[PDB]
């Protein structure tokens, strides 16, 4: 028996845009040229690996989103006060 029965609700468009939106909060970049630089490919590959691990860690689409958004919350709001507190 396996509780996972939610993969059929997902789309390739959702997968693509959620990987993209993961990257936007993992590192917002200094300027839009920094999204195109070769070092951002490491950030992008890390975001792809995280997306797949959070997907595999979930028995529902809601739990998958919750796991994505909690790790996004950590990565964004930890650095926003450890490195950007003065805003």
């Amino acid at each position: 028996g396996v509780r996972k029965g939610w993969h059929e609700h997902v789309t390739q468009d959702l997968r693509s845009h959620l990987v993209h939106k993961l990257v936007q909060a993992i590192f917002p970049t200094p300027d839009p040229a920094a999204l195109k630089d070769r070092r951002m490919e490491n950030l992008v590959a890390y975001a792809k690996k995280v997306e797949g691990d959070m997907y595999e860690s979930a028995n529902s689409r809601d739990e998958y989103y919750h796991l994505l958004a909690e790790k996004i919350y950590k990565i964004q709001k930890e650095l926003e006060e450890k490195r950007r507190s003065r805003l």
Binding site: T11, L14, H17, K21, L22, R61, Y65, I72, Y73, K77
Partner: peptide, 25 residues
């Protein structure tokens, strides 16, 4: 900190509504 927290939490979970909606239910 609250507006940007709800903003971050919503920013991901809105994507399925942006791409394929919820009017089917």
């Amino acid at each position: 900190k609250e507006k940007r927290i709800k903003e971050l939490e919503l920013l991901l979970m809105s994507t399925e509504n942006e791409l394929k909606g919820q009017q089917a239910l």
